Design a protein around this motif. Structure first.
Motif, PDB file in Angstrom:
ATOM      1  N   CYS A 144       0.836  -1.196   0.000  1.00  0.00           N
ATOM      2  CA  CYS A 144       0.000   0.000   0.000  1.00  0.00           C
ATOM      3  C   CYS A 144       0.870   1.245   0.000  1.00  0.00           C
ATOM      4  O   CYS A 144       2.094   1.149   0.109  1.00  0.00           O
ATOM      5  N   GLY A 145       0.243   2.407  -0.153  1.00  0.00           N
ATOM      6  CA  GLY A 145       0.956   3.675  -0.114  1.00  0.00           C
ATOM      7  C   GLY A 145       1.554   3.952   1.251  1.00  0.00           C
ATOM      8  O   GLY A 145       1.263   3.253   2.223  1.00  0.00           O
ATOM      9  N   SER A 146       2.401   4.970   1.334  1.00  0.00           N
ATOM     10  CA  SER A 146       2.889   5.412   2.631  1.00  0.00           C
ATOM     11  C   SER A 146       1.718   5.996   3.425  1.00  0.00           C
ATOM     12  O   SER A 146       1.010   6.867   2.919  1.00  0.00           O
ATOM     13  N   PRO A 147       1.508   5.507   4.665  1.00  0.00           N
ATOM     14  CA  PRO A 147       0.438   6.013   5.532  1.00  0.00           C
ATOM     15  C   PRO A 147       0.501   7.530   5.696  1.00  0.00           C
ATOM     16  O   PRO A 147      -0.527   8.168   5.926  1.00  0.00           O
ATOM     17  N   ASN A 148       1.705   8.090   5.560  1.00  0.00           N
ATOM     18  CA  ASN A 148       1.955   9.510   5.778  1.00  0.00           C
ATOM     19  C   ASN A 148       1.374  10.398   4.699  1.00  0.00           C
ATOM     20  O   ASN A 148       1.189  11.602   4.931  1.00  0.00           O
ATOM     21  N   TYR A 149       1.093   9.794   3.539  1.00  0.00           N
ATOM     22  CA  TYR A 149       0.539  10.471   2.350  1.00  0.00           C
ATOM     23  C   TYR A 149      -0.959  10.168   2.111  1.00  0.00           C
ATOM     24  O   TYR A 149      -1.566  10.712   1.183  1.00  0.00           O
ATOM     25  N   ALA A 150      -1.538   9.315   2.956  1.00  0.00           N
ATOM     26  CA  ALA A 150      -2.921   8.873   2.827  1.00  0.00           C
ATOM     27  C   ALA A 150      -3.889   9.930   3.327  1.00  0.00           C
ATOM     28  O   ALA A 150      -3.667  10.536   4.389  1.00  0.00           O
ATOM     29  N   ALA A 151      -4.953  10.142   2.547  1.00  0.00           N
ATOM     30  CA  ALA A 151      -5.998  11.135   2.828  1.00  0.00           C
ATOM     31  C   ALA A 151      -6.960  10.666   3.937  1.00  0.00           C
ATOM     32  O   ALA A 151      -7.168   9.455   4.100  1.00  0.00           O
ATOM     33  N   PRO A 152      -7.553  11.617   4.696  1.00  0.00           N
ATOM     34  CA  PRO A 152      -8.506  11.286   5.771  1.00  0.00           C
ATOM     35  C   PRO A 152      -9.618  10.344   5.327  1.00  0.00           C
ATOM     36  O   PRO A 152      -9.975   9.438   6.070  1.00  0.00           O
ATOM     37  N   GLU A 153     -10.151  10.554   4.127  1.00  0.00           N
ATOM     38  CA  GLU A 153     -11.274   9.759   3.621  1.00  0.00           C
ATOM     39  C   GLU A 153     -10.882   8.313   3.303  1.00  0.00           C
ATOM     40  O   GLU A 153     -11.722   7.419   3.363  1.00  0.00           O
ATOM     41  N   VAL A 154      -9.619   8.092   2.956  1.00  0.00           N
ATOM     42  CA  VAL A 154      -9.094   6.738   2.771  1.00  0.00           C
ATOM     43  C   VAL A 154      -8.855   6.066   4.140  1.00  0.00           C
ATOM     44  O   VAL A 154      -9.416   5.007   4.442  1.00  0.00           O
ATOM     45  N   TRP A 168      -4.674  15.774  -1.890  1.00  0.00           N
ATOM     46  CA  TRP A 168      -4.120  15.582  -0.550  1.00  0.00           C
ATOM     47  C   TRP A 168      -2.661  15.111  -0.629  1.00  0.00           C
ATOM     48  O   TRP A 168      -1.791  15.707  -0.008  1.00  0.00           O
ATOM     49  N   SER A 169      -2.398  14.063  -1.409  1.00  0.00           N
ATOM     50  CA  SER A 169      -1.040  13.599  -1.691  1.00  0.00           C
ATOM     51  C   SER A 169      -0.104  14.726  -2.150  1.00  0.00           C
ATOM     52  O   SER A 169       0.999  14.891  -1.595  1.00  0.00           O
ATOM     53  N   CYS A 170      -0.540  15.481  -3.168  1.00  0.00           N
ATOM     54  CA  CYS A 170       0.253  16.576  -3.715  1.00  0.00           C
ATOM     55  C   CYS A 170       0.508  17.679  -2.697  1.00  0.00           C
ATOM     56  O   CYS A 170       1.522  18.379  -2.776  1.00  0.00           O
ATOM     57  N   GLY A 171      -0.399  17.799  -1.727  1.00  0.00           N
ATOM     58  CA  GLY A 171      -0.313  18.798  -0.664  1.00  0.00           C
ATOM     59  C   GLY A 171       0.749  18.424   0.339  1.00  0.00           C
ATOM     60  O   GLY A 171       1.468  19.291   0.849  1.00  0.00           O
ATOM     61  N   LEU A 219      -4.848  20.657   2.106  1.00  0.00           N
ATOM     62  CA  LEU A 219      -4.921  19.756   3.260  1.00  0.00           C
ATOM     63  C   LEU A 219      -6.204  19.970   4.073  1.00  0.00           C
ATOM     64  O   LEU A 219      -6.175  20.199   5.281  1.00  0.00           O
ATOM     65  N   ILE A 220      -7.330  19.892   3.369  1.00  0.00           N
ATOM     66  CA  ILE A 220      -8.660  20.025   3.945  1.00  0.00           C
ATOM     67  C   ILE A 220      -9.247  18.624   4.060  1.00  0.00           C
ATOM     68  O   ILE A 220      -9.243  17.838   3.092  1.00  0.00           O
ATOM     69  N   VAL A 221      -9.703  18.324   5.273  1.00  0.00           N
ATOM     70  CA  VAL A 221     -10.192  17.002   5.686  1.00  0.00           C
ATOM     71  C   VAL A 221     -11.407  16.540   4.871  1.00  0.00           C
ATOM     72  O   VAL A 221     -11.426  15.405   4.385  1.00  0.00           O
ATOM     73  N   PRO A 223     -13.107  16.157   1.657  1.00  0.00           N
ATOM     74  CA  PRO A 223     -12.647  16.180   0.257  1.00  0.00           C
ATOM     75  C   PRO A 223     -13.522  17.009  -0.681  1.00  0.00           C
ATOM     76  O   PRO A 223     -13.039  17.459  -1.731  1.00  0.00           O
ATOM     77  N   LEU A 224     -14.792  17.194  -0.320  1.00  0.00           N
ATOM     78  CA  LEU A 224     -15.730  17.997  -1.125  1.00  0.00           C
ATOM     79  C   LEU A 224     -15.460  19.501  -0.993  1.00  0.00           C
ATOM     80  O   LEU A 224     -15.913  20.286  -1.835  1.00  0.00           O
ATOM     81  N   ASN A 225     -14.719  19.879   0.056  1.00  0.00           N
ATOM     82  CA  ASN A 225     -14.223  21.248   0.269  1.00  0.00           C
ATOM     83  C   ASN A 225     -12.784  21.506  -0.195  1.00  0.00           C
ATOM     84  O   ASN A 225     -12.317  22.642  -0.207  1.00  0.00           O
ATOM     85  N   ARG A 226     -12.085  20.442  -0.562  1.00  0.00           N
ATOM     86  CA  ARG A 226     -10.688  20.519  -0.952  1.00  0.00           C
ATOM     87  C   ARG A 226     -10.625  21.195  -2.326  1.00  0.00           C
ATOM     88  O   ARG A 226     -11.492  20.949  -3.196  1.00  0.00           O
TER      89      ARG A 226
END
Length: 252
Positions: A144-154, A168-171, A219-221, A223-226
């Motif tokens: 899997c991806g690095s946990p440090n780059y994973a978005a809140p919704e994931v 989120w990743s790019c942020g 980095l907005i939790v 995702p619909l507001n990101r």
């Protein structure tokens, strides 16, 4: 030492391509990486990827024994380059960030199966251009991806996901490049996931208003507001010294 029009030099790794061999074209002297397999579908999908900042497939050779992929050469990793130097200027970071965002935007417009951006897939070539290794066939370490780059919704799974996970990743990548440290830092997994889900991180005061503002909207939790990828590309800070070739067709 020879394969088709190529002369083998040495072995290196290239992100998701793994161990490859650096080779010189035997007439032009062009540097190339040879990925030797001793697949059909994965090649076709890679053939579709034609962006200046995504690793390109040049050719496929059949050794009637092995399949050799002739791919773009990039012998460095972006985070290595970032680490092996002192704090880099906002303008150097933005330069890299513009290339990444364009490659991401390209992936969205075409219907390309989403791949979690991994730090190790962000390569650098000799022009100091980002080259994203995007390939998917090592795997005894993590799946899997690095946990440090994973978005809140994931992380929460509690929500569903989309193309806003890439923002989120790019942020996180943009934060790492400007601050030389991860925004969400913790050594314990459940602690790291709690800070990610709640959007808890510090914006250094050495950052410009432009850089700090863009990060803060990525980095907005919820995702619909990101901020979307397309709006990132019109941001006042983003747009500074932006080469035109990086724009999507509608913005050119």
């Amino acid at each position: 030492a020879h394969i088709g029009n190529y002369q083998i030099v040495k072995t290196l790794g290239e992100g998701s391509f793994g161990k490859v061999k650096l080779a010189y074209h035997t007439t032009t002297g062009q540097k190339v990486a040879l990925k030797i397999i001793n697949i059909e579908r994965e090649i076709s999908y890679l053939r579709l990827l034609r962006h200046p900042h995504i690793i390109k497939l040049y050719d496929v050779i059949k050794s009637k024994d092995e399949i050799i992929m002739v791919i773009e050469y990039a012998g460095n990793e972006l985070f290595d380059y970032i680490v092996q130097r002192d704090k880099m200027s906002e303008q150097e970071a933005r330069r890299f960030f513009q290339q990444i965002i364009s490659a991401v935007e390209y992936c969205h417009r075409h219907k390309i199966v989403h791949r979690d951006l991994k730090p190790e897939n962000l390569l650098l070539d000799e022009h100091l251009n980002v080259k994203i290794a995007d390939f998917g066939l090592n795997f005894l370490k993590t799946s899997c991806g690095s946990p440090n780059y994973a978005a809140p919704e994931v992380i929460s799974g509690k929500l569903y996901a989309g193309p806003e996970v890439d923002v989120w990743s790019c942020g996180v990548i943009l934060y790492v490049m400007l601050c030389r440290r991860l925004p969400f830092d913790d050594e314990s997994i459940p602690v790291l996931f709690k800070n990610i889900s709640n959007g808890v991180y510090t914006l250094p005061k050495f950052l410009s208003p432009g850089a700090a503002g863009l990060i803060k909207r990525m980095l907005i939790v919820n995702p619909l507001n990101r901020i979307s990828i397309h709006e990132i590309m019109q941001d006042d800070w983003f747009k500074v010294d932006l080469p035109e070739y990086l724009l999507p067709p509608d913005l050119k």
